[PDB]
Design a protein around this nucleic acid. Structure first.
Lengths: 127, 126
DNA sequence: ACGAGGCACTTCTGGCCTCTG
DNA sequence: TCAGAGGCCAGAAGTGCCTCG
């Protein structure tokens, strides 16, 4: 109901917009509640052995941004993360523009709650 | 959430197989009032049941039904699971179809709704 | 009878890759 | 190159058939 139906309109140009692709990527984003972002961060971190993960503030909910050293399907990440929940909203999408998406998440009206490397894609190549 | 199996007085009728790939045409489901009303409609559309009834059982509801083709209990269960809601659901094969239905029609049990006017009689079962 | 379980699909899952603009 | 659509693939999971005891 009041739950978002997509990511914030300001992030949309950075996200993947495939509906029918079997393409795999290495940068994903997840939009969920405050409660689930905490749990998801660690779980996701361990499962996918993330080269990077950050947790962000978004309009009274949270966004998880993360890079993975291996390629995954958006639906594979989605399925893994839905099997934690039930039960609360979750939008999961591939990210096409990693620097841009990261840096947008560090500025208003978004902010960093916590991240696994300080400064992230601004301070580190993940090449 | 609540109950952990079917009422003990109906257990003799059910199949308890856990390692069988055998398929059946009679099943019963234990669940809440809200879930049983819905699974009545949806199991019938889904399996195009030859008969389906919904009954009062101790705070909750049982659904009994016969399907025109053969299914694995695990199928009926994977389907019925997908319409919960971490509300509870016991789903089992029925070995003794008539005896199960007839028990569910008498005290402590009663019929709420069934897909045939005046339910089932003994002939009907083979 | 009925539970165990061999078997045979078929559907699902989650990667690969090329094509195309 | 990029990114979405989709061919293809292999291994897992699903949901039937059967016969054996």
């Amino acid at each position: 109901v009041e739950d978002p139906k997509d990511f914030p309109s300001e992030l949309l140009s950075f996200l993947s917009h495939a509906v029918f692709s079997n393409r795999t990527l290495a940068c994903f984003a997840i939009y969920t509640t405050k409660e689930k972002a905490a749990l998801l961060y660690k779980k996701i971190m361990e499962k996918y052995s993330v080269t990077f993960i950050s947790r962000h503030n978004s309009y009274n909910h949270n966004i998880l941004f993360f890079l993975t050293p291996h390629r995954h399907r958006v639906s594979a990440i989605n399925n893994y993360a839905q099997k934690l929940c039930t039960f609360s909203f979750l939008i999961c999408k591939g990210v096409n523009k990693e620097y841009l998406m990261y840096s947008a998440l560090t500025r208003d009206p978004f902010s960093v709650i916590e991240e696994s490397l300080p400064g992230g894609l601004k301070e580190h190549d993940f090449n």
